[PDB]
């Protein structure tokens, strides 16, 4: 009868595994985590239930030393181990920091395997800070292009955008958590969509329609209360300052609105218009509604945007 979607989040390389570690700390049920690295010492500290050391013959348990070809060969030589860990997933999020050796080279191989295994495959990757220099940025760009060829949808977070949301004292780790929220809240928004039946119900097949073989994507969530809550939640959903791909130009959108018994038709249209006017395109919308009576004055808008 009913379908149960298996979501897996895969961290590849140092930055991706720290995202996984921090997401596990935050708490994420129903999602399964996989940690993939050449660096055996970092893998030893991973909180992920499923750990895969790749490239031990190539690196002797060290990182890739910024050589993406070593990350790529390490992933290819552990293909069977990667397939075994993914097998059964309906959706896979591959998160990695681009510009080093393991993420840049291995993350596109992991994404390709996930897609070959039948999983809807989303990449969420960072680009390096400009202060890391041009060779790092150029390697990262080759990684991004390789990711884009391997995934169904790709979200790119330029680390330079973190400098737009900090003050001179913000701990680096606090900035990194802001970047993690892009992946965490996207995963959580899909999980929630999949676990609850809506009054206007969207399910994993709608996620597939909007994300499959699409390229660049935006995933966002917004929460507001009071008057203008619908407009404010929709603006929050689509307005992250950390994204390379904004909502502008979107041609397909999956939008789900969750609220209490007070959720009004009028405000549902307001939220939908905010998104479609922001896109500045004729948006093919997949619209859903959930009534959670536990919510009183709160409204949550979830947006997945593709078709750029
Ligand atoms: N936002 C963020 N970026 C990171 C993090 N760790 C590393 N990076 C970035 O990701 C790039 C690659 O670093 P790393 O993942 O350790 O390299 P690799 O393990 O050899 O692939 C760096 O050049 C940084 O720009 C992190 O925790 N958060
Ligand atoms: K549903």
Numbering used by the authors: 8 to 315
Question: Any passages from the paper?
Answer:
First, GTP hydrolysis only occurs within the filament, as the complete catalytic site is formed at the interface between adjacent FtsZ monomers. We report a dozen filament structures of the FtsZ core (residues 12 to 316) from the pathogen S. aureus, hereafter SaFtsZ, in complex with various GTP mimetics and metal ions.
Interestingly, mutants Q48A and R143K supported assembly, forming polymers that are stabilized against disassembly by GTP consumption as compared to the wild-type protein. This correlates with reduced GTPase activity by about 6-fold in both mutants. The structure of the Q48A mutant shows that its K+ coordination position is occupied by water K2, indicating a role for this residue in securing K+ within the T7 loop for efficient catalysis. K+ is bound weakly and can be evicted from its binding site by subtle changes around the T7 loop, as observed in the structures of mutant Q48A and wild-type SaFtsZ complexed to GMPPCP and Mg2+. The polymers formed by the Q48A and R143K mutants were mostly filamentous ribbons, rather than the bundles observed for the wild-type protein. While the wild-type protein forms rapidly depolymerizing, single and double, wavy filaments, Q48A and R143K form stabilized, straight, thin filaments that slowly evolve into filamentous ribbons. These properties, which are strikingly similar to the effects of Na+ on wild-type SaFtsZ assembly, suggest that inhibition of GTP hydrolysis favors more rigid, straight SaFtsZ filaments that associate into ribbons.
